[PDB]
Structures are given as C-alpha cells and as structure tokens.
Design an enzyme around this catalytic site. Structure first.
Site, short mmCIF file in Angstrom:
data_model
loop_
_atom_site.label_atom_id
_atom_site.label_comp_id
_atom_site.label_asym_id
_atom_site.label_seq_id
_atom_site.Cartn_x
_atom_site.Cartn_y
_atom_site.Cartn_z
N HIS A 76 0.76 -1.25 0.00
CA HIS A 76 0.00 0.00 0.00
C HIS A 76 0.79 1.30 0.00
CE1 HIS A 76 -3.75 -2.16 0.44
NE2 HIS A 76 -3.27 -2.78 1.51
N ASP A 79 -2.30 5.90 -13.61
CA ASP A 79 -3.23 5.39 -14.60
C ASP A 79 -3.28 3.86 -14.66
OD1 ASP A 79 -0.78 4.91 -15.83
OD2 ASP A 79 -1.18 6.10 -17.59
N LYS A 84 -5.01 -9.88 -7.32
CA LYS A 84 -5.74 -9.26 -6.23
C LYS A 84 -6.86 -8.38 -6.80
CE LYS A 84 -5.23 -6.75 -1.88
NZ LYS A 84 -4.30 -6.06 -0.92
N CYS A 101 -6.34 0.47 -7.54
CA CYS A 101 -6.24 -0.42 -8.72
C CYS A 101 -7.31 -1.49 -8.62
CB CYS A 101 -4.84 -1.06 -8.75
SG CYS A 101 -3.51 0.17 -8.87
N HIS A 139 -3.59 -2.67 8.07
CA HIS A 139 -4.60 -3.04 7.09
C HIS A 139 -5.19 -1.78 6.45
CE1 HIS A 139 -8.54 -4.75 5.72
NE2 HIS A 139 -9.10 -3.78 6.43
#
Length: 117
Positions: free
Chosen positions: A11, A20, A38, A78, A111
């Site tokens: 992350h 993009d 994922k 994403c 998380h």
C-alpha cells in the site's frame, strides 16, 4: 513478515511514476500481487511518516476498530478487470485526493479498508 511490512509492500508508493491503468498493471506485478490477481488494492503516495501518524494524533477512531485520517492523501486505487484469477492481471486505476481508513496495531498501520471507497 510483520503486518506493518506487508502494509508497506501492498500500500505505499511514495513517488508514483504515473497514476493510470498502466501504472496499476506494472505496480501490482512488481509488488507480487498477481498470483492470484488481487481484486482491489490502493497505493498511498507521499511519505511514510504521514501514514504512520494516522495511528496517533492525525487519525480519529472510525467504527469499532478502524481509524480515519484527518487530512486527505494522494491515492491510486487499482481494480481488477476481466475477472480471471490467473495472470496477466489487467487493472483500471482511480486516482484521487481522499481521506483514508486503516487499522493500526502497536502504533503502526496494518490493514487498508478498501470498502471505504
């Protein structure tokens, strides 16, 4: 591994090369999030110290066990498209300047709450 190390791996990207679809496809592969693909993953930009501060005075309790940032962050989310768990994994990007919700343990982020977006 620790949950904090896993959080940075999944992350954090301080200075993103783009924001993009192609950026998402390259980064998910680089961080080993493509076997299997994922479904949804957000990268937070800027420095680490500002993210850790969410667990202290720069975050507030949100629901039972999460924390919301007091200020917005540059983020890129994403989202997997095509629906196949098998790579190559295609992604669509959604970039913005948004508050984030995380969980902290021992003062450290562990998380990311994707459902908040």
């Amino acid at each position: 591994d620790s949950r904090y190390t896993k959080f940075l791996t999944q992350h954090h990207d301080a200075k993103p090369k783009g924001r993009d679809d192609r950026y998402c496809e390259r980064m998910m592969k680089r961080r080993s999030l493509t076997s299997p693909c994922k479904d949804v993953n957000t990268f937070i930009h800027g420095n680490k110290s500002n993210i850790k501060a969410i667990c202290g005075a720069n975050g507030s309790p949100y629901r039972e066990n999460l924390r919301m940032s007091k200020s917005p962050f540059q983020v890129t989310t994403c989202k997997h498209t095509g629906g196949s768990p098998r790579p190559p994994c295609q992604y669509r990007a959604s970039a913005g300047f948004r508050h984030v919700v995380i969980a902290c343990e021992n003062g450290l982020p562990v998380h990311f709450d994707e459902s908040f977006f």
